[PDB]
Structure formats: structure tokens, C-alpha cells
Design an enzyme around this catalytic site. Structure first.
Site, short mmCIF file in Angstrom:
data_model
loop_
_atom_site.label_atom_id
_atom_site.label_comp_id
_atom_site.label_asym_id
_atom_site.label_seq_id
_atom_site.Cartn_x
_atom_site.Cartn_y
_atom_site.Cartn_z
N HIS A 182 -38.25 29.79 70.65
CA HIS A 182 -37.68 31.14 70.45
C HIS A 182 -36.50 31.11 69.51
CE1 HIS A 182 -39.89 32.01 74.24
NE2 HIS A 182 -40.17 33.13 73.57
N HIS B 5 -35.87 40.66 67.98
CA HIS B 5 -36.47 40.64 69.32
C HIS B 5 -36.12 39.51 70.31
CE1 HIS B 5 -39.65 37.92 68.26
NE2 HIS B 5 -40.05 37.91 69.54
MG LIG Z 1 -38.85 37.43 73.93
ZN LIG Z 2 -40.69 36.47 70.97
#
Ligand SMILES: [Mg+2]
Ligand SMILES: [Zn+2]
Ligand SMILES: CCOc1ccccc1-c1ccc(-c2nc3ccncc3c(O)c2C#N)cc1
EC number: 3.1.4.17
Length: 320
Positions: free
Chosen positions: A78, A116
Site C-alpha cells: 500500500h 486512496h
Molecule cells: Mg485501502
Molecule cells: Zn488501495
């Protein structure tokens, strides 16, 4: 929130983009992976094509992008690469369905896709909520997602970073709500309910894109389609991405074990043998229905479903 150096954003303004990539970037299977130094530049290109050359003042846009990059952590999955991968999938969706979305939505969605997973710590919502982390006290549901949106605003409210400043009082509130709803929709927990409702609205002819609730729902499924897009790339890319997802999931499982708690199998590195069957179940239960519903609603997104089916066949080949 962290601020980018003046060298970073100024280097971004003069960034060109090889002509060979112009045609490549329009394709759904496009893997940004080999063009690291070009990613912030790839985002500028995408915004300019979808939203127009004069949509945002180049200075603030380049400041925003480099500051968004600086607030992503050096986690295995991420991270910054993930943000750009997700924004690229959105770009391709938006380009292939251009007029179904407004100028504000296109700019809101590209920015939301890039933001995000802002300040992701390498930990899931279950973890933070289980181990009473402060973030889980501040946000009861969609823990990280509420924080990612809070991080977006923090970057917007930075000196010379407000990319939406030229919009009206009304439009700035609209774009911020588009961003918020899009970022909250990335919480996979919300997806299942969202996808079931859309399948219902489609199969009965009740789905109507002018209906704001139905619209927010379609936008939500698009955010899911983007967030899971590694399953839509060529098999060796999808495989490589799976290593990064596992590197993060297994580091989470390791922390749980140190606290005498057994993690679910996907976060347990001692359960690697079940990776192919785990991927298979995820494709059958999450990925395939997601793209299937997305293809029914937005037919030009069909290559995502075909590439996901292709990868499902690959995991099936691994099991045997
Ligand atoms: Mg996420
Ligand atoms: Zn993501
Ligand atoms: C969750 C979103 O992460 C992704 C996002 C995008 C693409 C894939 C993934 C993805 C990660 C892990 C797994 C996975 N790996 C397992 C390993 C061992 N044993 C059980 C497992 C299992 O049940 C699952 C499950 N589902 C499946 C899918």
C-alpha cells in the site's frame, strides 16, 4: 502532513513523457512498474488528457502530486506505486466512458485514486480495531479509509497545494464529497453490499445513472475495480504484485503472533501452500463478480474482466 521540496515539484513541470508510452497508457493492461521516475509525470499526463491542459494550475498540481508521494509510507504493498496503479486503472475507465462522467467527477476520481491509501501503515482495519489502535477510536468503521480522506484534506489545506481553489464554493464542496465517497468505497467490507445492490438494479432495469445514489454506487464499484486491478494485468505482473501483498499481510500476521493471536490464513506465512487456493477463492468470490458487474454497467471496461478471467485460469493451472 509532509511537504515536498521545491526541487521535486519543479522537476515534475518540465517532465515530458516518451511518445511510445502515449498509446500504451490508454490500455487497461498497462503496468507502470518499469517506469518509476515517470509515475508522478504519468499522473500529470493522465489528468491533462482526461480533464484538460488548463484544469489545474501546473504549480499547485505538481506541488500536490509530489506532496501526495511524500505522505505514502515505504510499506511493501500500500505504497506510492499502488496509488499510481489505481489512478491509471481509473484513467483507462474514465477515457473509455468519458461523457458518462462530469469534469468534476473525473478530476475528483483521479485525485481520490491517487490519495486512496495515503499514510497506510501496513495494517488492516481488523488489526487496528482488534488491538484498540488510536485510529480505530477516532473512526469506528472504514478506519484507514476515513484517515486516508483526512490525509487528502491535510494535503489540500497546504501552502500552494489547493488544486481546487479556482472552483466555486458549491463545486469545492461537491468535489470533496466525490473524493470522500470514492475513498470510503475502497473499504472492501462495503463492496459486497454495494455489488449485490448494483447486480439487483441492473438485472431488473432499475439502475439509472442520473439517480445520485445509484451514481455513487457505480463510482464505488469503479473504485473497487481500480483498487484490485493487479488481477487485471499480465500474469507475471499479477504474480509479482502478489509477492508484495503477501510481504505486507505476513508482516501483519507476524505482529499478531508476537501478541499470541493466530492470524487468518492470508496473513500467516506458515500457510503459503494455500496461496493458490486462497487466490482462487478471492477471484471466484470478489474479483470476477466485481468486473462482471462493472462490465454490465460500463461495457467498455470488458478487457478488465477478460484479464481477470485469464489470471483465474492461471491460478487454476498452479493448483494442478
Ligand atoms: Mg485501502
Ligand atoms: Zn488501495
Ligand atoms: C484481500 C485482498 O488482497 C488482494 C488484492 C488484490 C489481489 C489479490 C489479493 C489477495 C491476497 C491474499 C489472498 C489470500 N491468500 C491466502 C493465502 C493463504 N491461505 C488463504 C488465503 C486466502 O484465503 C486469501 C484470500 N482471499 C487472496 C487475494
Amino acid at each position: 502532513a509532509s511537504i515536498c521540496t521545491s526541487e521535486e515539484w519543479q522537476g515534475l513541470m518540465q517532465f515530458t513523457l516518451p511518445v511510445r508510452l502515449c498509446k500504451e497508457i490508454e490500455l487497461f493492461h498497462f503496468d507502470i512498474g518499469p517506469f518509476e521516475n515517470m509515475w508522478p509525470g504519468i499522473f500529470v499526463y493522465m489528468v491533462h488528457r482526461s480533464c484538460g491542459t488548463s484544469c489545474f494550475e501546473l504549480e499547485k498540481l505538481c506541488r500536490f502530486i509530489m506532496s501526495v508521494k511524500k505522505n505514502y509510507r515505504r510499506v511493501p504493498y500500500h505504497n506510492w506505486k499502488h496509488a499510481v496503479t489505481v489512478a491509471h486503472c481509473m484513467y483507462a475507465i474514465l477515457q473509455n466512458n468519458h461523457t458518462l462522467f462530469t469534469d468534476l467527477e473525473r478530476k475528483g476520481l483521479l485525485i481520490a485514486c491517487l490519495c486512496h491509501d495515503l499514510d497506510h501503515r501496513g495494517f488492516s482495519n481488523s488489526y487496528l480495531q482488534k488491538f484498540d489502535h488510536p485510529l480505530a477510536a477516532l473512526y469506528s468503521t472504514s478506519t484507514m479509509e476515513q484517515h486516508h480522506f483526512s490525509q487528502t484534506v491535510s494535503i489540500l489545506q497546504l501552502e500552494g497545494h489547493n488544486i481546487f481553489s479556482t472552483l466555486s464554493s458549491s463545486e469545492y464542496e461537491q468535489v470533496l464529497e466525490i473524493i470522500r465517497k470514492a475513498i470510503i468505497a475502497t473499504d472492501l467490507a462495503l463492496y459486497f453490499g454495494n455489488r449485490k445492490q448494483l447486480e439487483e438494479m441492473y438485472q431488473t432495469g432499475s439502475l439509472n445513472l442520473n439517480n445520485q445514489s445509484h451514481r455513487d454506487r457505480v463510482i464505488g464499484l469503479m473504485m473497487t475495480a481500480c483498487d484490485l486491478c493487479s488481477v487485471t494485468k499480465l500474469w507475471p505482473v499479477t504474480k509479482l504484485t502478489a509477492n508484495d501483498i503477501y510481504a505486507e499481510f505476513w508482516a501483519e500476521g507476524d505482529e499478531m503472533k508476537k501478541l499470541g493471536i493466530q492470524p487468518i490464513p492470508m496473513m500467516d506465512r506458515d500457510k503459503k501452500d494455500e496461496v493458490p487456493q486462497g487466490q482462487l477463492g478471492f477471484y471466484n468470490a470478489v474479483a470476477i463478480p466485481c468486473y462482471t458487474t462493472l462490465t454490465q454497467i460500463l461495457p467498455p471496461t470488458e478487457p478488465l474482466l477478460k484479464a481477470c478471467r485469464d489470471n483465474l485460469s492461471q491460478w487454476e493451472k498452479v493448483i494442478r
